[PDB]
Structure formats: structure tokens, C-alpha cells
Design an enzyme around this catalytic site. Structure first.
Site, mmCIF file in Angstrom:
data_model
loop_
_atom_site.group_PDB
_atom_site.id
_atom_site.type_symbol
_atom_site.label_atom_id
_atom_site.label_comp_id
_atom_site.label_asym_id
_atom_site.label_seq_id
_atom_site.Cartn_x
_atom_site.Cartn_y
_atom_site.Cartn_z
ATOM 1 N N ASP A 219 0.815 -1.212 0.000
ATOM 2 C CA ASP A 219 0.000 0.000 0.000
ATOM 3 C C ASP A 219 0.853 1.268 0.000
ATOM 4 O O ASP A 219 0.642 2.161 0.824
ATOM 5 C CB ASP A 219 -1.013 -0.016 1.164
ATOM 6 C CG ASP A 219 -2.150 0.990 1.005
ATOM 7 O OD1 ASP A 219 -2.306 1.539 -0.101
ATOM 8 O OD2 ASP A 219 -2.849 1.252 1.999
ATOM 9 N N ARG B 175 -0.907 8.846 1.609
ATOM 10 C CA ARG B 175 -1.594 8.775 2.902
ATOM 11 C C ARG B 175 -0.801 7.967 3.937
ATOM 12 O O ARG B 175 -1.025 8.131 5.135
ATOM 13 C CB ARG B 175 -3.027 8.224 2.745
ATOM 14 C CG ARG B 175 -3.051 6.743 2.375
ATOM 15 C CD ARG B 175 -4.438 6.133 2.136
ATOM 16 N NE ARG B 175 -4.288 4.895 1.358
ATOM 17 C CZ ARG B 175 -4.246 4.860 0.022
ATOM 18 N NH1 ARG B 175 -4.439 5.967 -0.684
ATOM 19 N NH2 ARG B 175 -4.042 3.713 -0.613
ATOM 20 N N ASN B 176 0.101 7.065 3.470
ATOM 21 C CA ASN B 176 0.893 6.211 4.334
ATOM 22 C C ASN B 176 2.310 6.723 4.580
ATOM 23 O O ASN B 176 3.091 6.022 5.206
ATOM 24 C CB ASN B 176 0.891 4.780 3.805
ATOM 25 C CG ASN B 176 -0.502 4.190 3.888
ATOM 26 O OD1 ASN B 176 -1.277 4.489 4.814
ATOM 27 N ND2 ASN B 176 -0.865 3.364 2.932
ATOM 28 N N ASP C 181 2.944 3.730 7.822
ATOM 29 C CA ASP C 181 1.841 2.794 8.080
ATOM 30 C C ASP C 181 2.108 1.491 7.352
ATOM 31 O O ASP C 181 2.506 1.527 6.184
ATOM 32 C CB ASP C 181 0.512 3.365 7.558
ATOM 33 C CG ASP C 181 -0.686 2.484 7.883
ATOM 34 O OD1 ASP C 181 -0.983 1.561 7.092
ATOM 35 O OD2 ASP C 181 -1.319 2.710 8.928
#
Ligand SMILES: C[C@@H](Oc1cc(-c2cccc3c2CNC3=O)cnc1N)c1cc(F)ccc1-n1nccn1
Length: 290
Positions: free
Chosen positions: A145, A149-150, A166
Site C-alpha cells: 500500500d 496517505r501512508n 503505516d
């Protein structure tokens, strides 16, 4: 529940337990819940809701084991855990610059701040995350992923360092629905056959590069997940972000090669980011002013 990384096994006993009395919550950061705290060491505190299932507990413990076993400057550090008190905590390195997705949107050049960001800032963020991805690839760990956002930033200013912050998707796979899969960041063999290799992260890195150079736009403008799935499976690729230099767009199109064997590994990606960083025609390109 045991965890293996780089052929080394670890268990909950290897996690660094921090005495609950030494931990103070200061403010909320976002959503379980995340707080800015103190141990003084400044930390980000990830909490496990006391109202949770046994699966949620195992997932929380697995997340703590995954982050604590990494050792790389572009991967958020885990200061320790507080698992012997409720609610349970995971203590991470406090990244004062916040998430990359929000930073790109809030720091976009504007009439009030025309040179708030330049191509070199974006290239440095891309290099930092590609270095973290290279570390994962060389240790045979598939993130699954890689997305803005991570990613987190150490500070809002020029000396900022970007890091992968993350590992929720990887934790879930180690051990749920199709509408929660990050379709827009996945290559065709991943959403079609569930085949994952280091080349899955290369494709997602290409999408993150587009997010960075677009200054935080959602990938595939106006397309839903199924529209993206059909578009990408049919050979469709995103257009260059606004003002994106050709050499940078070329890295993205190489990351998005249909065959995984035709996509570059992270050493080649870092080499290409380095060349872009050296090229005056790339770094002298002005970013759009919103
Ligand atoms: C788990 C969380 O971790 C951290 C978060 C932050 C952070 C994040 C946003 C703002 C601000 C800060 C700090 N001060 C701000 O103003 C710093 N350091 C962290 N370690 C995380 C990791 C990730 F990869 C992605 C997102 C999140 N996130 N954002 C909210 C809730 N969850």
C-alpha cells in the site's frame, strides 16, 4: 503469535514495554485513535480500543512487531509499546510534518507563498520513500500500500525527511473487502490474480510519484475504483501531473509497465530520481501556482 522478518523471528516478549506512568497524552492527531504524546521523548501514540475483538488485538500486536523489527532512516521508528495496561499503546517516532497527502495539499504554491515548494522538495520526498522501499525490497518485504496517505514528514521545512509510516495492509496479509482495497495503487496482476512481488510496490511507487508531482490530487481524476480497474487492465495510464517534467513522468510510466519484469527495481528508480535531481531542466521547472 510470532513474527518473521529477514529470516529472524520475534515475539511480543521482544517489544520494548514502556511503563504506563511515563506516558502522557497531549492532543489528538486523527483516526483507533492517534495522539501526540510524551515519554522527554515526543511520540505519536496509536491506541487499541478497549471495545475490540480478539482479532483486533492480534492485529494490533502484529503491527507493533512489524514496525519494531524494521531498521531504516526512511521507515518510522517504534519507540516501544504499552501493552500491559488498557487501552494498549504503540509508541511511534513523532513526525512533526504530518502525513504527506495533507502536506502536499496544504503546502501547494499560492499567490501568498509562490515558492513554498519547488521540484527539488518533491524529488527529495520521492528519493526518501524510494530508499525506504529499496530497504523493504532487499529484505523481501512487500508493503502492498505505497501511497501518500501512508507517508510521514519529520518537519514542514526544507530539511524534511519522508518516511513510510503505516503497515496496515502488510499486517492484514501476514495475519476485509474489495471496496477497501487500494485499487488505484495496484498493478493488474495484484487485483486480478492476487499475485504480489516487489514489483507490486514498484507500480504503487509510480502512483505515489504522481500524487507527489500533482501536489496531492487523488489518482485517476474522476474515475471510480472499477473504472480504474478496467482502464489500467486495458493499458490506460495517467497523464503527467500539471508542469511535470518529462524525465519524472518517464519514471512513472516505467513503474506502470504491464509486465512486472519490465518494471524497474528500487535501485534503478533511485538512480533515475538522482538523475532528475541533477538535471537543471527538471529542478528549474516551476510548480503551478493555485
Ligand atoms: C499513526 C500515525 O502516525 C503518526 C502521525 C503523525 C501526524 C499525522 C498527521 C498530523 C500530524 C502528525 C503529527 N503532528 C501533526 O500535526 C506523526 N507521526 C506519526 N508517527 C499515522 C501514520 C501514517 F503513516 C499516516 C497517518 C497517521 N495518522 N495521522 C493521523 C492519525 N494517524
Amino acid at each position: 503469535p510470532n513474527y518473521c522478518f529477514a529470516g529472524k523471528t520475534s515475539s511480543i516478549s521482544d517489544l520494548k514495554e514502556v511503563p504506563r506512568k511515563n506516558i502522557t497524552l497531549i492532543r489528538g492527531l486523527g483516526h483507533g485513535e492517534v495522539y501526540e504524546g510524551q515519554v522527554p521523548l515526543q511520540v505519536a501514540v496509536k491506541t487499541l480500543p478497549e471495545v475490540c475483538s480478539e482479532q483486533d488485538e492480534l492485529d494490533f500486536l502484529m503491527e507493533a512487531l512489524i514496525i519494531s523489527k524494521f531498521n531504516h532512516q526512511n521507515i518510522v521508528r517504534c519507540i516501544g509499546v504499552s501493552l500491559q495496561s488498557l487501552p494498549r499503546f504503540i509508541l511511534l517516532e513523532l513526525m512533526a510534518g504530518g502525513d504527506l497527502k495533507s502536506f502536499l495539499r496544504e503546502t501547494r504554491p499560492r499567490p501568498s507563498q509562490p515558492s513554498s515548494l519547488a521540484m527539488l522538495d518533491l524529488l527529495h520526498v520521492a528519493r526518501d520513500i524510494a530508499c525506504g522501499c529499496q530497504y523493504l525490497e532487499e529484505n523481501h518485504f512487500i508493503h502492498r500500500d505505497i501511497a501518500a496517505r501512508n507517508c510521514l514528514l519529520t518537519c514542514p521545512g526544507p530539511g524534511r525527511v519522508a518516511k513510510i509510516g503505516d503497515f496496515g495492509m502488510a499486517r492484514d496479509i501476514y495475519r476485509g473487502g474489495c471496496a477497501m482495497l487500494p485499487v488505484k495503487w495496484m498493478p493488474p496482476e495484484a487485483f486480478m490474480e492476487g499475485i504480489f512481488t516487489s514489483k507490486t510496490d514498484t507500480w504503487s511507487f509510480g502512483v505515489l510519484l504522481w500524487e507527489i508531482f500533482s501536489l496531492g490530487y487523488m489518482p485517476y481524476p474522476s474515475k471510480s475504483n472499477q473504472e480504474v480497474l478496467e482502464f489500467v487492465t486495458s493499458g490506460g495510464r495517467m497523464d503527467p501531473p500539471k508542469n511535470c517534467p518529462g524525465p519524472v513522468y518517464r519514471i512513472m510510466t516505467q513503474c506502470w509497465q504491464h509486465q512486472p519484469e519490465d518494471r524497474p527495481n528500487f535501485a534503478i528508480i533511485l538512480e533515475r530520481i538522482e538523475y532528475c535531481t541533477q538535471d537543471p531542466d527538471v529542478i528549474n521547472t516551476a510548480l503551478p501556482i493555485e
